[PDB]
Structures are given as structure tokens and as C-alpha cells.
Design a protein around this ligand. Sequence first.
Ligand SMILES: *[C@@H]1O[C@H](CO)[C@@H](O[C@@H]2O[C@H](CO)[C@@H](O[C@@H]3O[C@H](CO)[C@@H](O)[C@H](O)[C@@H]3O)[C@H](O)[C@H]2NC(C)=O)[C@H](O)[C@H]1NC(C)=O
Ligand SMILES: *[C@@H]1O[C@H](CO)[C@@H](O[C@@H]2O[C@H](CO)[C@@H](O[C@@H]3O[C@H](CO)[C@@H](O)[C@H](O)[C@@H]3O)[C@H](O)[C@H]2NC(C)=O)[C@H](O)[C@H]1NC(C)=O
Ligand SMILES: *[C@@H]1O[C@H](CO)[C@@H](O[C@@H]2O[C@H](CO)[C@@H](O)[C@H](O)[C@H]2NC(C)=O)[C@H](O)[C@H]1NC(C)=O
Ligand SMILES: *[C@@H]1O[C@H](CO)[C@@H](O)[C@H](O)[C@H]1NC(C)=O
Ligand SMILES: *[C@@H]1O[C@H](CO)[C@@H](O)[C@H](O)[C@H]1NC(C)=O
Ligand SMILES: *[C@@H]1O[C@H](CO)[C@@H](O)[C@H](O)[C@H]1NC(C)=O
Ligand SMILES: *[C@@H]1O[C@H](CO)[C@@H](O)[C@H](O)[C@H]1NC(C)=O
Ligand SMILES: *[C@@H]1O[C@H](CO)[C@@H](O)[C@H](O)[C@H]1NC(C)=O
Ligand SMILES: *[C@@H]1O[C@H](CO)[C@@H](O)[C@H](O)[C@H]1NC(C)=O
Ligand SMILES: *[C@@H]1O[C@H](CO)[C@@H](O)[C@H](O)[C@H]1NC(C)=O
Ligand SMILES: *[C@@H]1O[C@H](CO)[C@@H](O)[C@H](O)[C@H]1NC(C)=O
Ligand SMILES: *[C@@H]1O[C@H](CO)[C@@H](O)[C@H](O)[C@H]1NC(C)=O
Lengths: 122, 121, 369, 371, 367, 103, 103
Amino acid sequence: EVQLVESGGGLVQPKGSLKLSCATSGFTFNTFDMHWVRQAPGKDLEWVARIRTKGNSYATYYAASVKDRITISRDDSQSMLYLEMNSLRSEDTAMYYCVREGGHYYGYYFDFWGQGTTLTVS
Amino acid sequence: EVQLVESGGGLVQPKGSLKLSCATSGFTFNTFDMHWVRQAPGKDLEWVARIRTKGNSYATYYAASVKDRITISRDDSQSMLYLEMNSLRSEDTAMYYCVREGGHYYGYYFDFWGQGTTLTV
Amino acid sequence: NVTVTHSVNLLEDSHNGKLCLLKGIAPLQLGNCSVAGWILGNPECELLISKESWSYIVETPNPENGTCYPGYFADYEELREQLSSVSSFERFEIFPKESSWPNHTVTGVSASCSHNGKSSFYRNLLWLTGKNGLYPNLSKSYANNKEKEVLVLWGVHHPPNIGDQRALYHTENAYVSVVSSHYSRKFTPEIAKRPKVRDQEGRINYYWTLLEPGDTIIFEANGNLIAPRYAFALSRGFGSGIITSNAPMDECDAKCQTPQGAINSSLPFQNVHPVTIGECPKYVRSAKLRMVTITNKVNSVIEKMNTQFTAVGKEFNKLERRMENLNKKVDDGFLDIWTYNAELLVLLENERTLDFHDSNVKNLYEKVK
Amino acid sequence: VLEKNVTVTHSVNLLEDSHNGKLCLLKGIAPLQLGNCSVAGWILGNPECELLISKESWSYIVETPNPENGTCYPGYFADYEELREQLSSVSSFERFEIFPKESSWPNHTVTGVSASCSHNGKSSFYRNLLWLTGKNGLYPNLSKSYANNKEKEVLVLWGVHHPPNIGDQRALYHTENAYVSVVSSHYSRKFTPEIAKRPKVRDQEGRINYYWTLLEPGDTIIFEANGNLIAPRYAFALSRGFGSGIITSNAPMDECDAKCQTPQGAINSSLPFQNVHPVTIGECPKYVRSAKLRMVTNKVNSVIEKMNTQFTAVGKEFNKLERRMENLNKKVDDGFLDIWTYNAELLVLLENERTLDFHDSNVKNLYEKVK
Amino acid sequence: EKNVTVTHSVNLLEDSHNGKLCLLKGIAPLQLGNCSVAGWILGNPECELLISKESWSYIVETPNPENGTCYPGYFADYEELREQLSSVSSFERFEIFPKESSWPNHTVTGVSASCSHNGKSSFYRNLLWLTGKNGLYPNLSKSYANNKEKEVLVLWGVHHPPNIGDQRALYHTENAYVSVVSSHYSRKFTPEIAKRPKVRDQEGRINYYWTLLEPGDTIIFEANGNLIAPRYAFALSRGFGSGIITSNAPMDECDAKCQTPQGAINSSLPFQNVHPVTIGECPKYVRSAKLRMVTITNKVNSVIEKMNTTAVGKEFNKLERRMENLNKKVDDGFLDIWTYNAELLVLLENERTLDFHDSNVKNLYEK
Amino acid sequence: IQMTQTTSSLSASLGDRVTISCRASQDIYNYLNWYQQQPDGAVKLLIYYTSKLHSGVPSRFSGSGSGTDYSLTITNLEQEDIATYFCQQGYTLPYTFGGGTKL
Amino acid sequence: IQMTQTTSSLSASLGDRVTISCRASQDIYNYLNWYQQQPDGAVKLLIYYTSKLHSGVPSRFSGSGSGTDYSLTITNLEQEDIATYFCQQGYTLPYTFGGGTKL
Ligand SMILES: *[C@@H]1O[C@H](CO)[C@@H](O[C@@H]2O[C@H](CO)[C@@H](O[C@@H]3O[C@H](CO)[C@@H](O)[C@H](O)[C@@H]3O)[C@H](O)[C@H]2NC(C)=O)[C@H](O)[C@H]1NC(C)=O
Ligand SMILES: *[C@@H]1O[C@H](CO)[C@@H](O[C@@H]2O[C@H](CO)[C@@H](O[C@@H]3O[C@H](CO)[C@@H](O)[C@H](O)[C@@H]3O)[C@H](O)[C@H]2NC(C)=O)[C@H](O)[C@H]1NC(C)=O
Ligand SMILES: *[C@@H]1O[C@H](CO)[C@@H](O[C@@H]2O[C@H](CO)[C@@H](O)[C@H](O)[C@H]2NC(C)=O)[C@H](O)[C@H]1NC(C)=O
Ligand SMILES: *[C@@H]1O[C@H](CO)[C@@H](O)[C@H](O)[C@H]1NC(C)=O
Ligand SMILES: *[C@@H]1O[C@H](CO)[C@@H](O)[C@H](O)[C@H]1NC(C)=O
Ligand SMILES: *[C@@H]1O[C@H](CO)[C@@H](O)[C@H](O)[C@H]1NC(C)=O
Ligand SMILES: *[C@@H]1O[C@H](CO)[C@@H](O)[C@H](O)[C@H]1NC(C)=O
Ligand SMILES: *[C@@H]1O[C@H](CO)[C@@H](O)[C@H](O)[C@H]1NC(C)=O
Ligand SMILES: *[C@@H]1O[C@H](CO)[C@@H](O)[C@H](O)[C@H]1NC(C)=O
Ligand SMILES: *[C@@H]1O[C@H](CO)[C@@H](O)[C@H](O)[C@H]1NC(C)=O
Ligand SMILES: *[C@@H]1O[C@H](CO)[C@@H](O)[C@H](O)[C@H]1NC(C)=O
Ligand SMILES: *[C@@H]1O[C@H](CO)[C@@H](O)[C@H](O)[C@H]1NC(C)=O
């Protein structure tokens, strides 16, 4: 049905760029805004960044504390997602989730999720 | 300020025509409608006749008893209000006043009065 | 009636006579339901629930069955105008039936809206009724936060007599107060005995409002309420309208449609009907126009200034007679002025070119000698 | 165009500016002569307008510019300007006593008078209504019904009362919070009285609000109240038509002969235009705001006469709080008349030029034939 | 035919203007500016630089007036008032009910936090929020009588508190009413108590009404609660030659002949195309992009100028979609039929001028 | 139409609160002006409408009342404020003055 | 704003009626969804709005409540439905999740 495959994670020193990618299949990528969600070990779920479709000219809202270090883009033709992180820290050891928005007028609900990669720092 | 000087009062027989007069200073004669008020000795203040500005075609309104005996005119260029009487009576010995109305929407209030002239017969 | 060698007839009076597609998008075939019956979910209009996209709106001249429960639709004629330009809405359950009202009976039905022999009710409203003999105050709310207008509909019920009122809401002086950030009202029931219409005596008054992004609407009532169950997230557009017609449908694909058919030509002028939907020729109220054979550019100027109209006669109530005559006079004059303008233009145009051809040979005859 | 004030050889004026200046009959049918009265008084049976009752059929409605003396008991005719439009096309009516005054109300009082509607020095009331008041100090609930079994649309009127104070209300209806409910098959309302002190108008500190509704064949109307009701006593049986309206004029009446009518006079001519007034009733030609139009020596200018048709310019009255209305309607009326005078001006400023060149061409052709 | 070259042409159309608001024949116009019409008439606290002005040629208003009614509410019959306030030559503001000795039994020092001025809470300058004193709200009845041959504008308001505990702590009553009666008026307002979403951090509302007295008439107020009594009134004096225009242009000191929402025009050309809305005696509006006549013409322009001789474009409520489409249909028709009449005349006027000289040559040829 | 007044004369101290009332026969819709008459001299206007003030008048003069019962109150009276006062309508045409009060 | 939750632990038998409450801090106009995260695996969506259902979700899942007091009632528990459940607001920009409870 709907499959989200995420790859691109690995260990890195706390000064180097690291890029993650999430794959999509089984639907239309053009009409589904997608968000990135991070869950640290032993901590509750957190929101990271959200990208809207071409209707709002690819608006890119961001979280508060985790700004000025990410640029989210959507490769619609390749049906992938790109999450970039520069200048990491000691609080970014976590698994990162691919989330689809879902189109209906009942607010926001994140109707699908992914398996999730891992990302550590040293 | 706004002063009102009047003259023309004197003694006359009960058949003459004493034309009273009044003078103004300190404002524009073309935007105020003035009156005439007389007070006989032992009698309360009364009203005689009112003359309006050009906004009512110089309309003139008169009291009841005084009617059909007096006439007023406005000398706007000379800015001296003048009044003319006729057919006098022994019940017309009074002190006469030169009064100004004042333009605001609080009715009529007669804000500026003159010194007063003595007319006796 | 001068004989002409080669003529080009601008006016056209050919229409297919069948309801066709408009550039590949099907219309909303209301069929036997009026607009007031489609919106409120008539039980016998269940084939239009899922059609959330359309080009234009059709309606039979005498829609058989609309408001099943007798009543008076407040500001009905304005609702048609707002819905006459909606591109495509989205029907969403604003108050879910299962959980929104836990202390109220929600299974009330009426025998005047029968469906397949079984009494039913509307599909977009919900006749609330007290449970266990009690009618607690209800106080709902809805905050619209996705930058899209929301159309809300509700109703108030006027029972036939005092006996029926105290047996439903267990009160005598009920009230309904619908409050928003830029709209406030308060209603009251009117218990009176009325003659029979559709075998019913009581009445139901409908109402509506059009929300805005970031706004809130609060419902409060302790009696006589017909709460909403569905709303409509509108999405306005341009190039749509309401027509009244009876022609059958087909699988064709045209560019413009008229209440009596569709036009499949490119002549500047037509005479099928004053009203039209989509890009198509203009209208002239005569029966014979012809330019003897520049002319093509000339007709463009007439068309350019004429291309400002919708001509959809807005329906008016019975208490707005001054509306109608003023509106009828406005439309009558505009078409008659324009038909005379277009008629004389050709009459002036041909006289110039006829002498142009006459002087053409005379020009050669001038150079002949 | 390019010439001006050219002397002509044989002209035919196409403008009519002469009127008989008299209120004349239309096609041999006498008109309704309200004359001194008013539209509000005529319908409600004004005490000083009894002479107009005997008339049943008419052709148009006349009225003086400032009708003197109509609603004798002061009030506010609800939706008054709407009614005048409905009556601007009625061809006849049939005043029939919907509720007879002799047996409809055996339980109340019918003889109510007001000093503001005095007739011949005696106080009275209207003749199409009936002020109801209690008997023996009691005011029982009333409940009346009427079914329109006439195959005609019946017009109905009634009223509500707002007495000056609590004392007047109690002494008349013996209640505190009275209500009046009028319910039809497609018309429902519920009135209530408002008690307050008001400036004296016509030497009385009360008010009466007159309402109305219109029926349909097979319909039914229900009247209910427990007080504050000015009961109906007569109704109307409207019969529609075409070509009629309300014209305001001061012309004298006579036994003339005409074919149409205009407010300032009755015109009987054959020129395809006139400029006496915009408003015109009957079969006479169009109106062009101008001064002098002519064509040097039929079907040349019959298109304008054929396209100008179907235009009634009776200015519909608008309420005090409708200044957005009259400005819109004055814009429409002014624009249409000004545009149409430009079409008619140039419809003859061009044809006359051709005829001047037409005769020149005809003669010059003869010389070529001769030479 | 198409575009052509001619020896001498005079373009009737003009598409150039100074672009600055300026004086109209010698009287400075009212400049609401940073304030709206509803805010101005009610005397908004931050709208006090126009109290002195009492004469104007026209009235200006910014496209999005920031603050008007400081206390949230619904100005009843707003769009009608703007029509009656368009043709007012000059009014006169007088204290209809003096605060010193017209309410001696109540409390008149009532302010709210939503109308703060200079950081201190205040209220309007043309209204007076009445409240009980000592715990009593006595029955009030104040009468007025206009006897000076001038219409008088009167405004008041009714208060709808957010809840019930608010009511009994201000007016000490449960079901109050407000009555206003005149020689041709009658109303009876009642408060409505309900909870509303916050606007300007207030859950209450105040509805503002108005009426237009007539000479010799009498208006009588009566209320036992929830009344916002008037303090000032306006003695209207109807005139001609003014209107409401939305504009953002800067002000300047010159002397023009007419005004358009984007600038003033100083020229004698019969036509223009900048904007249809204007004030004064100045050229008409034609929607063409280029209109010309080959140089008759003086008579041609004046032939159709008289027939053309306001397009106010009155604002309509949000619940009057039938009105605006009706008026939009009327306004577009008149401006498109008229531009075609002038366009067609040029094709007919220039054509005649051609053979007018050619026949002279033929007449010269015969001679 | 006709204006009565209080007593003709009043005896006032230096520091008293002297009041004078001018009740009208008919109803004057809150148009009752006041005047002052210095002895052997002209007269001056104190108050118009009902409680407004004229430019150049001290702050211890004020009025009240409405309907057909008006008043004038003086607080902390001095020795210079001795004169005769009247009351005048402004409602209808035959403007009526007062019967005069001496202080 | 900040989204809270109920107690962090609960032990459930089989066939019992077990609920979990997710009380917010600021009024959310009925935009509270519920999720389920199986151990060492994916996380699903269970209920959106307040009481709707997602495709393929068993009919034993439902919720109720409005304002700032919600619940996710569970009836007739099976051996498969054991995981940690989180609640998420849907009103404003920082869509904050919950701390989640354990089964
Ligand atoms: C949808 O429209 C249909 C008709 O277009 C509605 O059914 C009609 O209902 C009326 C009364 O509810 C029926 O009138 C009665 O019919 C009986 C049987 O002949 C007659 O004896 C009575 O005197 C009365 O006239 C009418 O027959 C019936 N139409 C048909 C074709 O059966 C229906 O109610 C509408 N649906 C909704 C939800 O309003
Ligand atoms: C039908 O019309 C006549 C005239 O339009 C109405 O009679 C008029 O009534 C008014 C008001 O009562 C009279 O004015 C009064 O005159 C007296 C006497 O001078 C004066 O003292 C009052 O102050 C007031 O001005 C008017 O004279 C009178 N006209 C005539 C010719 O008698 C009559 O009321 C109307 N019919 C009905 C039923 O109202
Ligand atoms: C007059 O207008 C100003 C500007 O619109 C108002 O000031 C704003 O008030 C809102 C809340 O009322 C604040 O959120 C803005 O920050 C204010 N703007 C500035 C620049 O300070 C002012 O409140 C208005 N006057 C009244 C009485 O409401
Ligand atoms: C509509 O009403 C007609 C009336 O007889 C009926 O025959 C038809 O079945 C109804 N439905 C449709 C879809 O036409
Ligand atoms: C009504 O519902 C509320 C919760 O919304 C509940 O607390 C209350 O018990 C219910 N009332 C009855 C009578 O069950
Ligand atoms: C329900 O409403 C009535 C009238 O509006 C009120 O008297 C009653 O207190 C309300 N009930 C509650 C629980 O507030
Ligand atoms: C109406 O008023 C006029 C006033 O000119 C009067 O002469 C006439 O007798 C009155 N009645 C009728 C029926 O005209
Ligand atoms: C009222 O009328 C009914 C008949 O319609 C009659 O029986 C009854 O006695 C009347 N009421 C009185 C008080 O007489
Ligand atoms: C008359 O009407 C009142 C109003 O409801 C009612 O209370 C009373 O019972 C009625 N009287 C009769 C006899 O029905
Ligand atoms: C008007 O209000 C604005 C608020 O945006 C403020 O900046 C400005 O100073 C105010 N005054 C003027 C004269 O613009
Ligand atoms: C209230 O007003 C009346 C008349 O205006 C007055 O007599 C009374 O003293 C006033 N109340 C108080 C407490 O002074
Ligand atoms: C004020 O009006 C109320 C409302 O009817 C009334 O009950 C009260 O008696 C009135 N007060 C006076 C002093 O008349």
C-alpha cells in the first residue's frame, strides 16, 4: 500500500554535514506534505520541520530550537525526501521518522509513519 | 472687544418720530442678527423687534402690541443699526438696548448688550 | 432585401439540444432536487453525496421535492448566489454523531420525509431531543484553522401546539443563540396552529452562516434545536453558474453551454438564449445580420465592449417586487441598446465597402484613359 | 456633424411638445380619481373619502402632489412602498365583507371612535377596519379563519395598537402582555405592543401599525390574538391587468376624448416622439429629452420606436432609510434617457446627410446621361 | 483602419496627473487618515486632531483604516450613514446633554482598557457610558427639541455584557430595555447575554445606532439599563460637491480644479482615463487607451459631453451579494457603452475630414 | 409663555450660598439663559442653555434643573457680585424675560 | 501548548475495559489524535479528530471527551494489541506529542 523506506544514517563527528533520505511508493507525491519527526532514546516524541506542496510555493516551516541548521527539499520526480543537518550537537542522537500529512479537514494527524533510521554523534 | 454705543434719545411730543441709532465695533456685521429691547420704569424687560441677516432675506419679526408702528433697517456698510418709530404713546417711555444674538445651536441667548438710551415724552 | 453576391451570416441559431460536457468536466445533475434540498440532504437525493466536483449546475424547472419538513428558508435567495461560483467543496463531519452529543437522543425521525416507505430525516442535520426526560444546556464550538471558509447550516423548530413542546424539550420558553466573532443572533419559538401542508402543522426555520479562517462559532440552546452534523469547506472560483433546463444528458464535449443546448461554431453572434456559460458568441435580439463580402476586426470591438455580463437573473422573493422590476428594467435595456448598436453597424459598414468596390473599377477606369 | 442651422425646404418635425393639460379618459374608460385623497386613505376607507367606494373598475390612479389627510390615526404603514407597486397594475377589485359586521363578532364591541378621524363634527373610525374592545370588562381569546374560495388573490389588511401608557392598555383590553399572531399557509408572524410616551401628532399620544398580506387560491388565513387587535371588517379581491399605475398631477378633469395620458396633460398626435414628461400611460410614442428634432423630406426611424418599447418610468417611492436605492435608481433612469437621446440625435444627423447627397447624385447622373 | 500617421492631431484623452492630493478651489479637505469614518464620528480617542475642522471640500480615508470602533460591536446601518455623510457641506458639534448637569444621579466616569490613550484607559469623546451610583440606577428620560431649521444627527449605543454577573454589578437588573421614540421613529432594544470569542481582548459588545431629526421634531430617550447615552450631537447642513474617496497619496499645497483618487488634473482636454471616480467640474472618463481626431472637434467633444453629464460606488454589506452584482452590472455597462460611442465617432469624424478637403481640391479642380 | 420667579429681594452675606429659581408656566425644552444687571449701568450674560458658561465668568456660577424648574447657585459669594438678575426663554418667538431679583 | 498525559504505566488483563486520558494545557478545539507504537517496529495512527476511526482499525477502538479531557477506551483486549500509546495535539504550529504510557 504505502511504503516509506529511510536510509542515509551513520556515525559522524560533531562538525560534519550528514544527510538522510526517505523513499516513497504507492501513492502520489505531489499532493501530500511530509514532515520529519525525531525521537531521542528515553525521551518523548519531537517535531523537527515541515514542508508544504507546490500550492504554497514549497513553504518550509521550522521548529524553534532546531533552526538555522536544516534545509528540507522534496525531489518530486524521484519521489524522495532530503533532510540535512550541519553543526550537530550532543542532543541529536536519535531515530528520525518519515511522516506523511494526510488530506482531510480534521486538523493534522500524520496518517502514516516509517521504520526509521538511527544517527549517533561522538 | 465688542462695544455698543447708542444715541438719539430725547424728549418729544406724542406725535413725533424719533429715530434711534446704535453703533458696533469688533466683529463682522454680516453674520449676526440683532434685536431691540426696551425697559420702562417699574416694568420688566420686554421685546420689540428682531432683524435677521441675509440668510433670511433680511426678515423682520415684531412683538404683538408694538406691531404696525415701528420699522427697523440694517446699515451693514456703515455697521450702525438704526430704528425708526412712529405714532408714539404715553406707554412707551423706556430705556432702549442694542443687543446681539450670537451664532450657536443653543437657542437664542443675546450675549452682548449696550449702555442704553433714555426716551421720554 | 438587397441581393448580395457573397454573404457571411454573423448570427447563428443552431444548438445541439442536449446537455453536454464542458471541456471534460461533468456538471452537477441535481435532477429532482432543488438547491435547498441538495444542501440539507434530502433522503431522496442520495445520489449527489459523493459528487464533490462540478462545472455548472442544472435544475429542472419545477423541482418536485425540496424541504421535506415544511418551513421557511431564511435568506434562501442569497445562498444561491454564494453557491453559484463555488468551484468544488468538501463535505466533512463537523460534529461526529457518535461522540459529539452523549446526553441527547439523536434518532428522531419524521413521517413527512419518507424513504422507501420508512420514515427518515435529513442527512446533514440532526433533530436533537432530550433523553430521560431531561434537556441539558448544550454548548458547542468550532475553530476553523486551515485557511478555508466553512458553510454552516442549522435549524429551529416551531412545534404545532403547547402539548407537543412540553413533551419533547420539557420547557416552555426556549431559545437558541448562535454567536460568532462578527455575527450574533437569538431566536425564539412561535407556538401557533397552522393549516396542513404535506400533512404537517409544525414548521422548521433554517439558517446559515459563512465562517472565515481563524474564526470561531459558538452554539447555545436549551430547546428547539436542529444541530448540524455536516459542514462544507468551500473553495471559491470563477466560471460557473446555475441554470434551469430540462434537456437530457450526453457524452459530448463542447466549449459553451446554454439552457437550450450547446454551441459548436465560431461566428461572433448567436440568438439561442441571452444566458450562456463558458466562452461562446455574444447575443443579438434580431433574426437577420449579414456583412456582404476589416469586418472581422470590426466585430471584435463590438465583442470586446460586450464581454462584461453574466445575465443570470437573480431570483427574488415575493416581498421584493421593487427588486424585480428594477432588475428586469436593467436587463431589458442593456440587450436592446446593444442589439440596435450591432444592427446599424452592419448597415453603416456595407454602404462604405459597396462604394469601395464601385470606386475600385472607377479607379481603373480613371487610369484606363 | 459639420453643418449647423441649415435652412430647409420641407421638414417634418418628429417631436411633440403640446398637451391638452387635462385629466382625460383612456380609451373611453373613466379613470380612478383619488384627487384630494391618498392611497393609504383609499384602501383603509378614510372617513373623508367615502365617495370613492362606489367605483370598482378604473384605468389608472390619480393623486395630488401633497395629499392632505390620509391615515387619520397616526402610525407606520409597514412595507407601504411595496403595496403601491402591487396596486400599480390592478385592473379591478371587489370589496366584499370578509367578516360581516353583524355576526362575525358577537362577543366583543364594534362601535369604536377616534377624535382624530372626525366626520362632520362627529368622531368615527375607518370603514374597512374595526377597532375591537371588550364587553362587560372581558376580552376573550378570538380565533377566526378564512378560506379563499374565490379563485382570486384576496388582499387583506389589519392593525395593532400601541396605547400611550399602562392605564390606557388596561382600561381597554384588561391585560399586561398581549400578543397578536397572524398565520397563513406560507406566512407566519407574531406581533407585540410597545408602550411608550411619544410626541403629540394630530393631538394623540398613541399609534396604530397597519400590516397586510396577500392570499392565493386554495389558501387559508388564520387570525388569533388576545388583545391589541384592530380586526378586519372588509377585504379585497384583486384582478390583475396591464397598462396602469399611479400618476401625480394637478390637472382639472372633464369629459374629453384621448388615447393615452401624461401627468401634465393628455397628448393626441402622431409624431414618433414627445418631450412633455418621462412618465406616460397608454399608447403614445417614445420620449426624447431634447429641444428640436426634424428630418428633411416613415420607415427611416421606425427602429428606434420599435426598440424603445416596453419602458415604464414611474418612479417607485423609497423609504427614508433607502438612500442607496434612489441613487441607484436615479442613475439608471438618467443614463437610459441620456443614451437614448444620443442614438436618436445621430439617427437623423446621418440620414439627412445622405438625402442631401442623394438628390445631388440623382441630378448629376442625368447630366452624364444628357452629356 | 489600423494605426496611421497624420499631420496634426489632438489627443482628447489625458493620462498624466500630478499624483498629489491638493486643495480644491481653495478649501482644505478633511483628512481622516489614520482613522476611520466610524471612528471619527464616534470620536475615537486617537482621532482628536479633527475636532477643530468644520469645513471641507471632500473627505479622505486610507485603504485599510487601522482603528475605528475601539470597543468591539456592530455599527447598525453603517453603509447608509456614509451616503448621508457624503453631501454634508459643514456641521457643528454642540454638547447636546452637558455632562455637568444632565446626569446628576448616575456615574459618568466610565472607561475601558480597550480604548487606551497614552497608556491610560479612556472612552470616546462623543458618548457617555452611564452606570449606577450608590447602588441605584434610576429611571432616565431625557427629551430634546430641535427648533432652529437644521437637521440634528444623534448617536447612542446599547451594551451587551459578556455574562450575567457583569450585568447585576453595573445596572442591578436582570431584564433591562432601551426605548427611543420620535415623531416618526420607534424602537425597543433588549440586551443579549452570551459568551463570544475574544476580539481586542473583550467578550462584550456594544451596538451603535443613529437617527436624523427634523426641524420641529422631538426625540425622547427612555432606559433603565444598558444605555450608552449621547454627549455630543451634530447640526447638519446639507451641501453639494463632496464624497468619500480611498487614497494613500501625500498631501501638498497647490490649487487644482478637480481631484481623482490618484491625483489632480490641470488641463483643458475633454477626456481622461486615470479613474472614473472624481470630485469637481473636470473631464469625463473614457476606457480607451488612445483616442484622437485628425486636425468640428470642439463641437464633437461637447456633443457627447452634455449627454454624459457620479459613480460613487457605495459600499455594501457582506450579506448583499445581490446588490453588488446588480450595481456592478450597471456600472460596467455605462462605462463600456459610452467608450464605444466616442470610439465610433472618431471613425466617423475623421472620415468626413478626408473628403472635406478632397472635395475642395475637386472644387479647386473645377475652379 | 410666562415666567414667575423667587422673591424680589434677598439679603446675602459675604461667604454664603445664594440660590434663585425661575419656574416657567409652560415647558421650555431646556433653554433658560441668565443675565446680570450692575446698578446704574449695562447688563451682562452669565449662563446660556442651562448650565454652560460664558467666556470671562468666574467658576462659582452654575445652574441646574430641567423641565419647568431651573435654578442658579452661587458659592463663596464676594462683595463685587451684587446686581439684579433675570431669566429668559429661548424656545418660542415672543421671548419672555424675568421679574427681576435684587441682591 | 505543552501536552501532558496520564500515569506512565498500566497492567492490563485480557477482556477488560482499560482507558488512558490525555489532558492538555490550553483549549484545543477537538484536534487530539492517538497513535500506537509496537516494540521494535513501526508506529500507527489509531484515531484522529476525537472519535473517528482509521481504515483497518478494529471496532474495539474508540474515544470520547471534548475541551481538555479526552480518553481512548479499549474493550476486549487481545494478545496482539500491546504497545505504547501517544497523543498529539493538532491546533497550533508546534504540534507537541505526549509522553506516552506503557501496556
Ligand atoms: C420526492 O418527490 C415525490 C414526488 O415527486 C414525493 O412523493 C409524493 O408525496 C406526496 C405527499 O407526500 C404524495 O401525494 C399524495 O399521494 C397520494 C397517492 O396518490 C394521494 O392520494 C394524495 O392525495 C397525495 O396527493 C405523492 O403521491 C408522492 N408522489 C409520488 C410519485 O408517489 C416525495 O415525498 C418527495 N421526497 C421528499 C423527501 O420530499
Ligand atoms: C381631511 O383633511 C382636512 C384638511 O386637510 C383635515 O382637517 C384639518 O385638520 C387640521 C388638524 O385638526 C386643522 O388644523 C387645525 O386648525 C385649527 C383651527 O385653526 C388650529 O387651532 C389647530 O392648531 C390646527 O392647526 C385644519 O384646519 C383642518 N382643515 C380643515 C379644512 O378643516 C381633516 O382632519 C382630514 N380628515 C381626517 C379624517 O383626518
Ligand atoms: C489605534 O490604532 C493603533 C494601531 O493599529 C492601535 O495600536 C495597536 O493595538 C493592538 C492591540 O489593540 C496592538 O496589538 C498593536 O501592537 C498596536 N499597534 C501599535 C503600533 O502599538 C491602537 O490600539 C488603536 N487605538 C485604540 C483605541 O484601539
Ligand atoms: C425524477 O422525477 C421523475 C418524475 O416522474 C421520475 O420519473 C424520475 O424517476 C425521478 N428521478 C430521476 C433521476 O429522474
Ligand atoms: C452529560 O455529559 C457529561 C459530559 O459531557 C457528563 O458528565 C454528564 O454525566 C452527562 N449527563 C447525564 C445526565 O448523564
Ligand atoms: C440550562 O439553561 C437554563 C436556561 O437557559 C438555565 O436556567 C440553567 O441553569 C441551565 N443549566 C445549567 C446546568 O447551567
Ligand atoms: C381637497 O382639497 C382641496 C384643496 O384645494 C379642496 O378644494 C377640495 O374640496 C378637497 N376635496 C376634494 C374632494 O377635492
Ligand atoms: C363567546 O361566544 C360563544 C359562541 O361563539 C358563546 O357561547 C359564549 O357564551 C361567548 N362568551 C360570552 C362571555 O358570552
Ligand atoms: C386565553 O388565552 C390565554 C393565553 O394563552 C390562555 O392562558 C387562556 O387559557 C385562554 N382562555 C381560554 C378560555 O382558552
Ligand atoms: C497611525 O497608526 C500607525 C500604526 O500603524 C502609526 O505607525 C502612526 O504613527 C499613526 N499616526 C500617523 C499620523 O500615521
Ligand atoms: C435623583 O434625581 C431627583 C430629581 O432629579 C432628585 O430629586 C434626587 O435627589 C436624586 N437622587 C439623589 C440621591 O440625590
Ligand atoms: C422605572 O421603570 C420600571 C419598569 O417598568 C418600573 O417598574 C419602575 O416603577 C420605574 N420607576 C419609577 C420611579 O417610576
